[PDB]
Design a protein around this ligand. Structure first.
Ligand SMILES: *[C@@H]1O[C@H](CO)[C@@H](O[C@@H]2O[C@H](CO)[C@@H](O[C@@H]3O[C@H](CO[C@H]4O[C@H](CO)[C@@H](O)[C@H](O[C@H]5O[C@H](CO)[C@@H](O)[C@H](O)[C@@H]5O[C@H]5O[C@H](CO)[C@@H](O)[C@H](O)[C@@H]5O)[C@@H]4O)[C@@H](O)[C@H](O[C@H]4O[C@H](CO)[C@@H](O)[C@H](O)[C@@H]4O[C@H]4O[C@H](CO)[C@@H](O)[C@H](O)[C@@H]4O)[C@@H]3O)[C@H](O)[C@H]2NC(C)=O)[C@H](O)[C@H]1NC(C)=O
Ligand SMILES: Cc1nnn(Cc2cc(C(F)(F)F)ccc2CCC(=O)N2CCC(Sc3ncc(S(N)(=O)=O)cc3F)CC2)n1
Ligand SMILES: [Ca+2]
Ligand SMILES: [Ca+2]
Ligand code: NA
Ligand code: NA
Ligand SMILES: [Zn+2]
Length: 805
């Protein structure tokens, strides 16, 4: 109930929302059908359009007009955005030579540069080049300000998840808006685009920028706009608010455009009908910039031009239908489209088995344009699992395609030629970033970065302390002229032990054999110094990682590698080694095929044993430092130590072996040596964070040897590849992965073929950021370099995506 008898006389676009049954005059009132009777009349004036003309210049103030060309308009702060161009011979901002903004040039009374976030729906990254001739204002912003070639959205690449990730710095799994459509089993409620339930605050986790602002005494314009309010009115309102008294005027503002997304859905991302939408957005940017210039705010305000996601070509003919795989199709509900989420139609149906459903969707047609996944087997980079609103069954849909339940859904609901929501590494989903203003840099290209990092930068820009979030603060300091956050390395929590030789062979009863009873003084001096760390400068190039939780571990040195061996988990947390360009691959000899040797530095009671692996019919074992790459026949013995050993399913061994035997050498050739740090990961509760001992759900049969859920490797080299990895004077180059440790290769449809036809493809799917690996391990890499910490942070957030240019 709204008693709409009240008025918006002098309350138009009020910043503070008033509580029912008083009527509302804010920029959201329409959407809740709650505006006062006169709102349209007073607040949505359209008389005479949006631009001054020669004859209007110096006119008599007619309050009915949408914007004003009178002489008093500047002081009221309600002129048309072109008033000074037409009525005072000033130039449009786009026609002006751009000039470095070394410091904020603001009016007196401004306590900080304001921030204007100009967000655009479906603004695919490639529009910056491909639409440049029709977008001169945006193109000025881009070239004079700071820009990245693209910005990576979060998965799913939909609107609501991404706009709210921009607002909070949080992954959808953490903020809760996990799709445009959702069901919450705890609430027994649903969330839709249409309707009212999306206005309840229990859906919306984390702390968005405007609340972070308000709580620290920085005033915020309201970010949301009702869809009926034209774009021109939104700009004029922002400019009106900027004219307000110093004690009332907000410091942070948001504009939103529904274009180009709206048109892109109908006409495809590059349809000829798309040129006009891009023209109008650019015209809107020009209106804003011309307004800021009239108010002498154009060299004061920092403007962010940012998109939420891109757009792909998708038509009805390219729709896979679950009815061509599943017989039981009525007993399930599907969230459809560019991603698939399946749950049961009724929880009273006990016969619903998600296992048999996954199997029925697995490699069934030879060109199948989706892959099913238990949500916890989704690549860790998507961070799309740890929320009760994300269904256990998920379908990652191929770019260009759609998934529906039945054919009736497609022809009872061809209309669209574009869509989005796919995997966030897909080029067509990439979007834009431009920063322009005194606090941003001048004519600077920055590398691609993920949208989860902006929240921190927008806080920096406003002198705010960010709420806890998934950004890595300082990873984008290179966007800013000043105002930078100056971060410290986390303090190491657990210091390592450095065990020497403390145990005799005969104390070990592992059930392990090795064919190694093989016998000088100078060569025995030589092997001790390898076991005290003479080649550690070689294999540990960036310092040892720091352990940031309480645990008990040992550094173990060897000729070819160095490990941090966990006594609690009975394996390394990490193993570091360097393969130069010149290094050579040898085979595992016949005498050492099933050789596992006791490590005399580590007690029997903190070691694995071979008997457990024998008794476990499902589980075999592998090695973190690969025997294949031992530097000498003598050094190869070190690779068979029990402390280099880890549990591996035979299906995963195929992957691991190919990676170790072929790809590691390949990368060293292509990159001029590589440093490799490999290790296990335990995420049984799929929260993206290192598991404690008591969260481990599976052990090797009849033992305390915990089974990893994943295996990682960080592959580092010199960005200048003319210098070898071990002698790099400059910036580093990194690529990493988190492979799921799975007992079958059902994920790879071509896995019965040779490993050269599917393994590298699987690793690409599971590419990762070092920062991903850090959350999952509690480790901190790159502790000792000649590089700045900010540069290291940027490097830690890098993702190698394996997409073309
Ligand atoms: C991305 O960044 C985010 C943000 O930094 C990271 O998420 C944080 O991770 C922390 C560790 O997991 C987590 O800390 C916990 O806080 C609990 C209190 O949580 C409330 O308060 C915060 C702060 O205001 C608030 O933000 C939370 O909001 C969540 O929940 C509501 C829904 O109820 C949503 O509105 C919102 O979307 C958000 O949901 C998301 O997070 C929750 C977890 O909080 C998930 O469950 C959801 O699926 C969703 O992803 C909350 O309102 C606190 O209760 C926890 O304490 C337990 O664990 C500690 C460990 O120190 C233990 O010592 C205690 O005993 C305690 O256990 C007790 O409860 C247990 C279960 O009921 C039980 O087992 C025990 O026996 C005890 O009874 C914990 O300290 C923090 O909340 C989240 N924050 C957010 C916003 O998600 C995220 O990790 C980052 N991701 C990556 C990959 O880096
Ligand atoms: C979603 C979303 N998350 N954050 N934003 C704001 C936001 C963040 C950023 C940013 F700066 F972050 F880039 C830039 C712009 C915006 C404005 C988006 C906008 O005006 N839209 C039209 C209205 C619809 S839906 C609607 N739904 C819930 C509420 S409520 N309960 O939270 O009040 C109110 C609503 F009207 C959403 C899209 N939209
Ligand atoms: Ca969108
Ligand atoms: Ca975990
Ligand atoms: Na076995
Ligand atoms: Na297979
Ligand atoms: Zn859309």
């Amino acid at each position: 109930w709204t008693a709409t008898s009240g008025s918006c006389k002098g309350r138009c676009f009020e910043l503070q929302e008033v509580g029912p049954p008083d009527c509302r005059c804010d920029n959201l009132c329409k959407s809740y059908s709650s505006c006062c009777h006169d709102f349209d009349e007073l607040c949505l004036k359209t008389a005479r359009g949006w631009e001054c003309t020669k004859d209007r210049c110096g006119e008599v103030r007619n309050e009915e007009n949408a914007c004003h060309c009178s002489e008093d308009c500047l002081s009221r702060g309600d002129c048309c955005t072109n008033y000074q161009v037409v009525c005072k011979g000033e130039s449009h901002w786009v026609d002006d030579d751009c000039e470095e903004i070394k410091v904020p040039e603001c009016p007196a009374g401004f306590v900080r540069p304001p921030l204007i976030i100009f967000s655009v729906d479906g603004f695919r990254a490639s529009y910056m080049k491909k639409g440049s001739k029709v977008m001169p204002n945006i193109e000025k912003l881009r070239s004079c300000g700071t820009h990245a070639p693209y910005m990576r959205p979060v998965y799913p690449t939909k609107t609501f998840p991404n706009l709210y990730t921009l607002a909070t710095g949080l992954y959808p799994e953490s903020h809760g808006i996990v799709g445009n459509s959702m069901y919450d089993p705890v609430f027994d409620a649903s969330f839709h685009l249409r309707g009212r339930e999306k206005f309840n605050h229990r859906w919306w986790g984390g702390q968005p920028l405007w609340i972070t602002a308000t709580k620290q005494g920085v005033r915020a314009g309201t970010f949301f706009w009702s869809v009926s309010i034209p774009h021109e009115r939104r700009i004029l309102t922002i400019l009106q608010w900027l004219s307000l008294p110093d004690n009332e005027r907000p410091s942070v503002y948001a504009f939103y455009s529904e274009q180009p997304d709206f048109s892109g859905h109908k006409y495809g991302p590059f349809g000829p009908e798309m040129t006009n939408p891009l023209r109008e957005i650019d015209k809107t940017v020009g209106q804003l910039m011309d307004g800021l210039k009239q108010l002498r705010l154009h060299r004061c305000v920092n403007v962010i031009f940012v998109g939420d996601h891109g757009m792909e070509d998708v038509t009805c003919d390219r729709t896979e239908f679950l009815s061509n795989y599943l017989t039981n199709v009525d007993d399930i509900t599907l969230v459809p489209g560019t991603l698939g989420r399946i749950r049961a139609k009724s929880i009273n149906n006990s016969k619903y088995d998600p296992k048999t459903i996954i199997a029925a969707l697995t490699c069934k047609k030879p060109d199948q344009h989706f892959k099913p996944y238990m949500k916890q087997h989704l690549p860790k980079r998507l961070h799309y699992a740890n929320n009760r609103r994300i269904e256990d069954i998920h379908l990652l849909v191929d770019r260009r395609w759609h998934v529906a339940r039945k054919p009736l859904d497609v022809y009872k609901k061809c209309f669209f030629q574009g869509d989005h929501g796919f995997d966030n590494k897909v080029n067509s989903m990439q979007t834009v970033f431009v920063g322009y203003g005194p606090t941003f840099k001048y004519r600077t290209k920055v590398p691609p970065f993920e949208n989860i990092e902006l929240y921190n930068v927008m806080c920096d820009l406003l002198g705010l302390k960010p709420a806890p979030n998934n950004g890595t603060h300082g990873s984008l300091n290179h966007l800013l002229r000043t105002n930078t956050f100056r971060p410290t390395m986390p303090d190491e929590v657990s210091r390592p032990n450095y065990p020497g030789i403390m145990y005799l062979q005969s104390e070990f009863d592992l059930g392990c054999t090795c064919d190694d009873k093989v016998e000088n003084k100078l060569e025995e001096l030589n092997k001790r110094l390898h076991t005290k760390g003479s080649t550690k400068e070689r294999h540990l190039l960036y310092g040892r990682p720091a352990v940031l939780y309480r645990t008990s571990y040992d550094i173990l040195y060897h000729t070819d590698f160095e490990s941090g061996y966990s006594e609690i988990f009975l394996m390394p947390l990490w193993t570091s080694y360097t393969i130069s360009k010149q290094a050579e691959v040898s085979s595992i000899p016949e005498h050492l095929t099933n050789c596992v040797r006791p490590d005399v530095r580590v007690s029997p009671g903190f070691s694995q044993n071979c008997l457990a692996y024998k008794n476990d019919k499902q589980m075999s074992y592998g090695f973190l430092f690969p025997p294949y790459l031992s530097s000498s026949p003598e050094a190869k013995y070190d690779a068979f130590l029990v402390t280099n050993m880890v549990p591996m399913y035979p299906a995963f061994k195929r992957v691991w072996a190919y990676f170790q035997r072929v790809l590691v050498k390949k990368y060293a050739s292509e990159r001029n040596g590589v440093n490799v740090i490999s290790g296990p990961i335990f995420d049984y509760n799929y929260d993206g964070l290192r598991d404690t001992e008591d969260e481990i759900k599976q052990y090797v049969e009849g033992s305390s040897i915990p089974v990893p859920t994943h295996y990682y490797s960080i592959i580092t080299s010199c960005l200048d590849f003319t210098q070898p990895a071990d002698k790099c004077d400059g910036p580093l180059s990194v690529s990493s992965f988190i492979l799921p440790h799975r007992p079958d290769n059902d994920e790879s449809c071509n896995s019965s073929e040779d490993e050269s036809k599917w393994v590298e493809e699987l690793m690409k799917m599971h590419t990762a950021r070092v920062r991903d690996i850090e959350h999952l391990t509690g480790l901190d890499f790159y502790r000792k370099t000649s590089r700045s910490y900010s540069e290291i942070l940027t490097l830690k957030t890098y993702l190698h995506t394996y997409e073309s240019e």
